Ligand binder design. Structure first.
Ligand SMILES: CC(C)CCC[C@@H](C)[C@H]1CC[C@H]2[C@@H]3CC=C4C[C@@H](OC(=O)CCC(=O)O)CC[C@]4(C)[C@H]3CC[C@]12C
Ligand SMILES: CC(C)CCC[C@@H](C)[C@H]1CC[C@H]2[C@@H]3CC=C4C[C@@H](OC(=O)CCC(=O)O)CC[C@]4(C)[C@H]3CC[C@]12C
Ligand SMILES: CC(C)CCC[C@@H](C)[C@H]1CC[C@H]2[C@@H]3CC=C4C[C@@H](OC(=O)CCC(=O)O)CC[C@]4(C)[C@H]3CC[C@]12C
Ligand SMILES: CC(C)CCC[C@@H](C)[C@H]1CC[C@H]2[C@@H]3CC=C4C[C@@H](OC(=O)CCC(=O)O)CC[C@]4(C)[C@H]3CC[C@]12C
Ligand SMILES: CC(C)CCC[C@@H](C)[C@H]1CC[C@H]2[C@@H]3CC=C4C[C@@H](OC(=O)CCC(=O)O)CC[C@]4(C)[C@H]3CC[C@]12C
Ligand SMILES: CC(C)CCC[C@@H](C)[C@H]1CC[C@H]2[C@@H]3CC=C4C[C@@H](OC(=O)CCC(=O)O)CC[C@]4(C)[C@H]3CC[C@]12C
Ligand SMILES: CC(C)CCC[C@@H](C)[C@H]1CC[C@H]2[C@@H]3CC=C4C[C@@H](OC(=O)CCC(=O)O)CC[C@]4(C)[C@H]3CC[C@]12C
Ligand SMILES: CC(C)CCC[C@@H](C)[C@H]1CC[C@H]2[C@@H]3CC=C4C[C@@H](OC(=O)CCC(=O)O)CC[C@]4(C)[C@H]3CC[C@]12C
Ligand SMILES: Cc1c(CC(=O)O)c(=O)oc2c(C)c(OCc3cccc(C(F)(F)F)c3)ccc12
Ligand SMILES: Cc1c(CC(=O)O)c(=O)oc2c(C)c(OCc3cccc(C(F)(F)F)c3)ccc12
Lengths: 707, 707
């Protein structure tokens, strides 16, 4: 049983009876003296936050982790070599520059990174974005000033890729220093699903150059994918059959083996390395049977051993690639943080979002100085490193050691590799991204505001491209928040069961509603896109407009005074005795510059008899009549207000108070009423006595005030 | 006194006891059969909505309104002539093409418009936008193929202005047909104040060409205002003193007269026409004293009488002015609707927002065909028409008649008008726009989220220009809504006074909190930018993490089973009798691909003795202990959810239920729980029995369930 015996409280009488604690407000300056004030155990936290390898490496369990890290590092270093060779073709540079992208960030992240299960390298979507930024940069360059010229057009693409990488790393490091690594929260799940599904189609289309062995120019556009499709299918009579059959065989075999490893995650230690076995088989059969001369297949060429000397970044490339580098930096950090958060939740260790930006930015800067291209983690390579038994970032060190031993020593192998095997290995990781097409039907019957976000993200990314489509999709996703709260379902309430329960007036059968009281609920925060709808729904829920009846009352009072000081109608302390039956009954029209005296509050204290405005006026004067005398506003679900709302609500309440209708606001916490004091909302007319605790408090106050 | 005696209801037991009405849901098709089904009194509403002149003109009070409309129309037609001559210089076309912009939209709006106090013409900000769009269009044109060539560069500006006008009218009419005239609600008051204050500075800077009589090229840029300032101040030694003294005298006189008319709005019928008197004086003294030859002043030239033949709009201009015409159409409709709403509220007549778009678009199309430029109402001209006694749109007809009689007959006057008097008349209306600089200090101490909107709107409009700055400002204003709800102040509640009142635990002195119960409140809607903060604040408010203690309980159960089926520890229906004191105390490590068996729910029904997890386990096993057994979530202020929130909340509640903690959600209406059924939120684990009416219902349910 629910039994309550209580006084009726009114948010001002409540705080008279209950002593508040009193908490000191923190202004701008004590935050400053709290932050910049050093201590011998304060700098030793910041330094260990900047170098986490000083914290995890002495706490290294040797006997449990070393033999697992060795095996995990070898098996992910092989995949890092092959994926680095494959993703350099998506930037259209020589393939040895993808091996440099798999070495330097994995060394910098070993010192400055906080994740333990992430392999750092390149991944296909970011390589497509870097290639688009490069071919957009070499077409905006100044034209400054016979036989070997198609090796010098790849010498400028390498420098453009290095400069784009250095600028993206600088943007990432500057975002990490300014401690704004919370920007991943502006990306909902529907936006990520739509972007991922469209970018999988981008990746699938851009691999058709190498499976068919066709020559496609460097389209950089809004509508790049359809131009690439037109350039491929205009010349499909010139394909190479030996490059197509091999890609089909490799894709089929790694597809039916890469799902045995998920069907049989138990029963089977160290899952089957199929990207290594198929590469060994393909490069061994392309040698010996002489595939480069029997057929005419494209191969990975002769890579020269060693590293390159450092480069100096071109500021002319920095001038006209800024909007591309911002998108590259944001996409790289968002992908890396989302992949690292899964294993951080799975193995229960903390993940610093601001240290990831510093580590990835430093890795990208050092990679771009030594002529690599940009990157962060890949989902498939991280899954290979984790599913083999990777416990920490020693596995990334051993993967970088294997990449180094391929660069320095054994790069004379992988010279008969057939360059469409490398394109078919990158298509084996598109299953989980393309299976997200079955989310339009799921989101259709659940929200319909996130289905719209999915469809608009897909369309913007397909039509506008990977960089500008994400920027358009974030803005549309912010529009849907305003769409959710434009027209809230406002309702009137009534009492059920003669108790303190008040629900919707249309929903139940024998609800009671007290005489002259109107309860109105708006289930949404009221802001600038919301206040005219609120005012319209309130004055249609109450039956009339208070400004119109105030104007008609002022007109009737003006006619009463005009007949009065002619000495026609008598004035008594009780009665309003008239003299004549009918007057000429004019409809006196007052012009502009005077029509706004009808909005003034009525002050009839000069007249002794109290006027009613609800019985009939003494001669044929026809002001309308209302039955309302009290209005409750249920503000429980109203989260915040702003300046437009405070002005509109102030106008509404001033119009209701001047027509002699008492207004009560009900259901707010103390932060709301404290914020309303800063807007200068209260004055001599709208007091602070209008706030009550619950609806039943206001109704019980009304039902004993009016008797 | 507040006395309630009631049963304890739980939102499922409430609806068993109270019969709901049952309302039929309206799907997609019955809306279609409701809308497209004609009637002989349905088409007669749509036709009278499309032609409001068939409704107001037979209801015309002749004796009250005719003599006021004549005087208002004459006095606003003079101002329309002078402002049309003045604003054509801001597009840099000959001045006779501003008289055509003051004639045709005022005739089309007489038939298709719903306002009664609006004068339709040009206004300065839209003329600056049209001029920028024109000079951007003539620089992107194809270059296709000696003495008189500076009259043919103004022949292309006229055609560009006409084409920009026709495209803007087409966009306006198409927006009005599609019934989307509610787009004015996306503009808050702070954005409008910042945009207006920056555009006043734009208007003030662009009038310096004519006061000083300097030659400035057509800068179209992001940063146009600073380039215009540099081009003016590089050559200020070449100014004309007779053009500066005259502009100063005219500006001073109309400034001190245009505020007498506000100080003396009473006492004074038909306010003083000072823009007419100063124009007559200036053009009469420039004649006779021969100002064109004594000094070297620029004058309004010889305008040829008559109208021009119709033009055909160039589609090449349509190709590269789309983003300009969208901004022109939106700014014109927003300004016209905001100015008309003031008089619609003042005189109590309805205003159709979708008919305004059709009327303004038709007027702009007809104006652009006959070589005028675009426009809508101006605030100063509308104030002149209203303050003289304008009752309806007959005053606009008489103003158009006076513009016609200037075009056809008496355009040989205003030939000695001095062209800086026209620039000084446009500066007399900048006082109310420049006085809005005292809103940074007002908004600073009130909201601080709208001060940011003001400052960013000012900076974006000054730096990027009038068209792109508004588009950037709308997006930043949408960002501030997410900024308001990123980190909501979540709190825990407690009971005051041993009644049904629950407030913040830190705020009062002798609050009670029941043993083992935790009440948690989030005062905001929970969406994608909000759910990780909610989960973090909830698991720091409750004292622990439920997933970690579930994993430790599963580890302890695995060690118990491993010691059990070795036959070491005995198993009883009551007791857990052991055998040995100490075992080897391993810390058994299970690898990846098996670590996710620790998140499974505990099912110890194979064991007869009930395990406690809160006393000590029989040997040295050290699972942590919790005191919580019930958790209330106060969801009163939670307005909506989305897919990310439903997934995160589902994970949180599943983690709390598996650790044997009962969860209650409290304070939601029926629309919330009806929307939660569509997300497939409920299953065999998370039931619908967890919803209660109020906090005291859930607390009273707990306090009798646990005894
Ligand atoms: C209404 C919402 C739901 C989607 C809005 C999509 C638009 C922003 C897209 C759709 C069609 C697109 C156009 C489709 C085709 C072209 C031609 C294209 O040029 C060429 O293909 C020829 C020249 C060249 O090869 O570069 C330049 C971009 C453009 C104008 C596109 C610009 C962007 C547009 C207008
Ligand atoms: C179905 C949705 C996702 C898109 C709807 C619009 C498409 C049907 C349009 C918009 C972009 C258009 C493409 C824009 C650019 C080009 C390049 C253009 O390349 C040329 O060689 C141009 C000159 C020539 O025709 O010879 C050929 C047409 C094509 C593929 C267009 C084909 C029709 C496309 C795909
Ligand atoms: C917003 C801040 C706190 C963090 C992010 C910093 C970036 C926005 C900055 C840092 C490096 C800057 C770049 C450093 C060097 C240059 C070259 C400089 O241009 C030239 O020197 C051009 C030649 C000339 O001066 O005429 C200015 C632009 C640019 C690309 C800068 C653009 C802005 C960048 C990317
Ligand atoms: C907290 C974060 C979100 C702040 C982000 C700020 C950026 C939006 C700003 C800061 C620095 C700006 C850059 C500063 C300078 C330039 C150089 C400018 O190029 C020139 O000036 C070329 C001609 C010349 O050299 O004079 C192009 C814009 C750009 C990259 C600006 C683009 C906009 C940037 C990146
Ligand atoms: C960080 C937030 C608060 C404001 C971001 C403002 C930027 C978007 C602005 C500020 C500085 C602006 C730049 C200032 C100066 C110039 C030079 C200007 O070129 C010239 O003046 C020379 C060539 C010519 O005369 O056309 C081109 C625009 C640009 C790069 C502007 C581009 C837009 C910028 C980067
Ligand atoms: C104070 C806030 C509102 C702006 C902060 C940045 C300004 C100090 C910058 C940004 C834009 C700049 C302007 C961009 C373009 C030009 C045109 C440029 O015109 C020329 O004649 C260029 C060649 C030459 O120098 O001879 C002269 C400098 C100026 C006015 C620049 C002056 C410095 C400005 C105003
Ligand atoms: C979104 C809809 C429901 C309302 C608003 C309509 C506008 C977005 C439409 C109506 C008129 C259209 C224009 C009509 C004519 C043309 C010319 C046409 O371009 C050409 O003919 C160029 C030459 C060539 O075809 O090669 C397509 C673009 C454009 C500017 C169109 C752009 C889109 C406009 C402005
Ligand atoms: C309900 C409202 C908000 C819808 C708004 C839709 C607009 C954003 C779309 C609809 C029509 C689109 C236009 C359709 C066609 C063109 C022509 C296109 O120019 C060309 O195609 C030039 C080359 C050629 O002729 O092939 C430039 C973009 C533009 C104006 C598009 C710009 C984007 C527009 C205005
Ligand atoms: C390339 C790639 C492949 C191939 C491979 O394995 O290398 C894959 O398998 O999955 C991917 C997924 C799921 C990706 O989505 C992550 C994400 C997470 C948050 C935010 C965003 C953002 F919207 F910002 F892009 C993206 C992205 C990229 C891949
Ligand atoms: C030119 C002009 C002048 C000179 C003259 O009188 O002719 C003036 O006196 O006042 C103006 C005011 C207040 C203006 O602001 C209206 C508004 C209303 C809603 C929305 C927007 C938007 F943000 F879309 F622009 C603008 C605009 C323009 C003027």
């Amino acid at each position: 049983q629910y039994i309550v015996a209580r006084p009726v409280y009114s948010t001002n009488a409540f705080e008279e009876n209950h002593k508040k604690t009193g908490r000191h407000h923190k202004t701008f300056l004590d935050h400053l003296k709290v932050c910049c004030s050093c201590s011998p155990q304060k700098a030793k936290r910041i330094v260990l936050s900047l170098f986490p390898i000083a914290s995890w490496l002495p706490a290294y369990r040797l006997k449990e982790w070393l033999l697992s890290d060795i095996v995990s590092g070898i098996s992910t270093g092989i995949v890092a070599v092959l994926q680095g060779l494959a993703f350099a073709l998506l930037v259209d540079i020589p393939p040895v520059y993808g091996l440099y992208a798999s070495f330097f960030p994995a060394i910098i992240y070993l010192f400055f990174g906080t994740s333990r299960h992430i392999s750092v390298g390149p991944f296909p979507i970011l390589s497509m974005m870097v290639g688009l930024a490069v071919s957009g940069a070499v077409s905006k360059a100044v034209p400054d000033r016979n036989n070997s010229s198609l090796l010098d057009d790849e010498r400028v693409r390498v420098a453009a890729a290095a400069s784009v990488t250095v600028l993206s790393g600088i943007i990432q490091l500057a975002f990490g220093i300014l401690r704004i690594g919370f920007v991943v929260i502006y990306l909902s799940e529907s936006l990520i699903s739509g972007f991922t599904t469209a970018a999988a189609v981008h990746v699938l289309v851009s691999q058709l150059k190498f499976i068919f062995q066709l020559t496609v120019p460097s389209h950089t556009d809004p509508v790049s994918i359809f131009k690439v499709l037109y350039s491929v299918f205009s010349q499909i009579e010139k394909t190479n059959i030996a490059d197509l059959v091999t890609a089909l065989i490799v894709l089929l075999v790694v597809s039916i083996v890469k799902e045995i490893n998920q069907r049989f995650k138990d029963k089977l230690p160290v899952p089957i390395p199929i990207e290594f076995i198929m590469t060994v088989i393909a490069a061994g059969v392309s040698y010996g049977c002489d595939f480069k001369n029997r057929f005419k297949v494209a191969v990975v060429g002769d890579m020269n051993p060693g590293f390159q000397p450092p480069i100096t970044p071109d500021v002319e490339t920095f001038q006209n690639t800024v909007g591309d580098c911002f998108g590259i930096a944001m996409v790289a950090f968002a992908v890396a943080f989302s992949v690292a958060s899964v294993y951080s939740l799975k193995y229960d260790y903390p993940l610093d979002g601001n240290q990831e930006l510093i580590a990835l930015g430093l890795g990208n800067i050092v990679c771009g100085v030594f002529r690599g291209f940009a990157g962060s983690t890949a989902l498939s390579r991280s899954a290979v490193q984790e599913s083999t038994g990777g416990k920490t970032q020693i596995a990334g060190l051993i993967g970088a050691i294997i990449v180094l031993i391929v660069v320095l020593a054994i790069g004379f192998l992988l010279a008969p590799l057939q360059k469409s095997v490398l394109a078919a290995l990158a298509l084996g990781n598109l299953k989980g991204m393309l299976m997200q097409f079955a989310e339009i039907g799921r989101l259709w019957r659940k929200d319909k505001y996130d289905c719209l976000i999915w469809i608009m993200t897909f369309i913007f990314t397909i039509v506008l491209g990977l960089g500008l489509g994400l920027a358009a999709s974030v803005a549309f996703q912010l529009l849907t928040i305003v769409f959710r709260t434009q027209f809230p379902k406002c309702s009137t309430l009534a009492n059920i069961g003669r108790t303190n329960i008040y629900k919707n007036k249309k929903d139940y059968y024998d609800m009671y509603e007290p005489e002259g009281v109107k309860i109105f609920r708006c289930p949404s925060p009221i802001y600038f896109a919301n206040i005219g709808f609120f005012r319209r729904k309130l004055i249609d829920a109450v039956g009339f407009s208070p400004l119109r009846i105030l104007r008609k009352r002022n007109k009737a009072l003006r006619k009463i005074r005009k007949l009065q000081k002619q000495g026609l109608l008598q004035v008594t302390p009780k009665g309003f005795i008239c003299t004549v039956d009918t007057i000429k009954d004019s409809d006196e029209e007052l012009d502009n510059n005077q029509i706004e005296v009808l909005d003034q509050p009525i002050n009839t204290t000069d007249l002794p008899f109290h006027i009613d405005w609800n019985d009939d006026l003494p001669l044929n004067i026809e002001v309308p009549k209302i039955s309302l005398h009290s209005l409750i506003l249920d503000f429980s679900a109203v989260s915040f207000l702003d300046v437009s709302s405070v002005r509109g609500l102030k106008s509404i309440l001033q119009e209701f108070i001047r027509i002699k209708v008492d207004v009560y606001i009900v259901g707010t916490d103390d932060d709301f009423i404290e914020k309303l004091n800063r807007y200068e909302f209260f004055d001599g007319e709208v007091k602070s006595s209008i706030f009550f605790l619950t609806i039943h408090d206001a109704v019980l106050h009304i039902l004993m005030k009016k008797d």
